[PDB]
Amino acid sequence: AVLFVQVNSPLQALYLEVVPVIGVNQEVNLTAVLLNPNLTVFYWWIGHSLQPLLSLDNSVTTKFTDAGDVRVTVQAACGNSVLQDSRLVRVLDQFQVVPLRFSRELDTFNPNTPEWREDVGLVVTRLLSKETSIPEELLVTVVKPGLP
Amino acid sequence: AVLFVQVNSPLQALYLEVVPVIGVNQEVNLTAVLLNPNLTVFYWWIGHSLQPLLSLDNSVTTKFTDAGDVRVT
Numbered sequence: 001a002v003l004f005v006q007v008n009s010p011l012q013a014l015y016l017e018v019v020p021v022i023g024v025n026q027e028v029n030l031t032a033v034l035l036n037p038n039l040t041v042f043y044w045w046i047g048h049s050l051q052p053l054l055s056l057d058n059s060v061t062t063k064f065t066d067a068g069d070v071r072v073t074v075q076a077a078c079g080n081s082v083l084q085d086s087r088l089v090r091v092l093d094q095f096q097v098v099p100l101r102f103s104r105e106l107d108t109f110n111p112n113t114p115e116w117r118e119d120v121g122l123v124v125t126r127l128l129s130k131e132t133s134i135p136e137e138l139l140v141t142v143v144k145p146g147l148p
Numbered sequence: 149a150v151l152f153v154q155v156n157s158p159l160q161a162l163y164l165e166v167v168p169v170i171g172v173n174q175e176v177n178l179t180a181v182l183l184n185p186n187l188t189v190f191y192w193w194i195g196h197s198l199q200p201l202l203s204l205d206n207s208v209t210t211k212f213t214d215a216g217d218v219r220v221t
């Protein structure tokens with residue numbers, strides 16, 4: 001007689017990591033940050049279609065043929081608890097991309113909390129608009145999750 | 149705000165349907181008979197490896213390069 005068992009009772013929090021903006025036909029490297037070993041259950045709701053993708057890995061790679069706003073949802077149920085996080089992203093076509101160096105010292109005070117990164121990008125956008133007199137909602141700053 | 153919900157509380161019984169014998173390098177059409185719509189969660193333990201396959205469908209198709217006795221769960 002055989003019996004497979006798994007032991008991961010408590011789940012704390014999850015977060016869906018995805019860039020707020022990318023062009024059409026571009027591969028998106030969606031990440032599902034969660035509390036966990038290779039024993040992880042991930043339901044992925046990429047778009048309108050109900051049928052979710054199953055994954056044991058944190059990340060998936062997908063594309064978007066259409067533009068506009070896309071709802072991306074991820075659900076985690078490793079044990080007997082259900083967590084879920086959603087995020088709406090913009091898929092554009094008319095834009096120009098500029099790389100941006102930050103000062104090194106910031107790295108020594110840089111937690112990867114997405115809200116910290118959001119506020120930093122917002123400050124950069126405000127300063128750009130104040131020093132170029134160009135519209136402010138047409139400038140999107142994303143400061144990545146990397147250690148540098 | 150968005151929230152996905154699913155509603156299938158009771159599960160009665162299951163049964164694994166598989167032929168008792170087949171040769172090597174032959175495709176096996178394993179079936180998992182269960183109480184259900186396309187909302188079905190299936191973990192497949194094909195052999196020695198712990199990592200199970202995920203499936204929403206009843207059936208899977210696999211092969212065996214080695215002979216002997218295979219545990220299919």
Ligand SMILES: *[C@@H]1O[C@H](CO)[C@@H](O[C@@H]2O[C@H](CO)[C@@H](O[C@@H]3O[C@H](CO)[C@@H](O)[C@H](O)[C@@H]3O)[C@H](O)[C@H]2NC(C)=O)[C@H](O)[C@H]1NC(C)=O
Nearest residue numbers: 012013014015032033034035110111112113114145146147
């Ligand atoms: C919950 O919130 C916490 C903060 O309260 C987040 O924790 C931080 O997450 C980042 C990203 O995973 C961690 O940085 C990582 O460090 C590893 C090295 O250990 C590096 O290889 C990765 O590339 C990444 O930079 C960070 O250490 C971690 N802790 C803190 C204090 O910032 C967490 O992401 C949030 N997650 C959930 C599921 O709620």
Ligand SMILES: *[C@@H]1O[C@H](CO)[C@@H](O[C@@H]2O[C@H](CO)[C@@H](O[C@@H]3O[C@H](CO)[C@@H](O)[C@H](O)[C@@H]3O)[C@H](O)[C@H]2NC(C)=O)[C@H](O)[C@H]1NC(C)=O
Nearest residue numbers: 158159160161162163164165166179180181182183184206
């Ligand atoms: C539980 O046990 C019951 C019997 O008490 C099994 O029920 C029987 O299962 C077979 C195979 O699925 C059914 O035959 C099927 O009929 C459909 C048409 O409806 C046909 O398209 C299929 O090819 C197949 O031949 C049968 O009707 C069903 N009921 C009876 C009274 O025999 C069941 O398979 C067992 N399953 C579990 C999960 O415990």
Ligand SMILES: *[C@@H]1O[C@H](CO)[C@@H](O)[C@H](O)[C@H]1NC(C)=O
Nearest residue numbers: 027028029030059060061062
């Ligand atoms: C996604 O990120 C991982 C981690 O760096 C990398 O190995 C992989 O090539 C990336 N894929 C794409 C399509 O960006």
Ligand SMILES: *[C@@H]1O[C@H](CO)[C@@H](O)[C@H](O)[C@H]1NC(C)=O
Nearest residue numbers: 036037038039056057199200
């Ligand atoms: C988890 O399993 C996958 C199988 O698809 C494998 O690619 C990955 O390396 C495994 N990770 C760990 C940490 O064992």
Ligand SMILES: *[C@@H]1O[C@H](CO)[C@@H](O)[C@H](O)[C@H]1NC(C)=O
Nearest residue numbers: 175176177178207208209210
């Ligand atoms: C498995 O059975 C289904 C149902 O008849 C059939 O469509 C499929 O081709 C079969 N595959 C193999 C490899 O026997």
Ligand SMILES: *[C@@H]1O[C@H](CO)[C@@H](O)[C@H](O)[C@H]1NC(C)=O
Nearest residue numbers: 051052184185186187204205
């Ligand atoms: C269930 O979803 C799968 C998607 O892989 C599809 O192939 C199948 O036709 C669907 N079945 C039903 C009954 O909707």
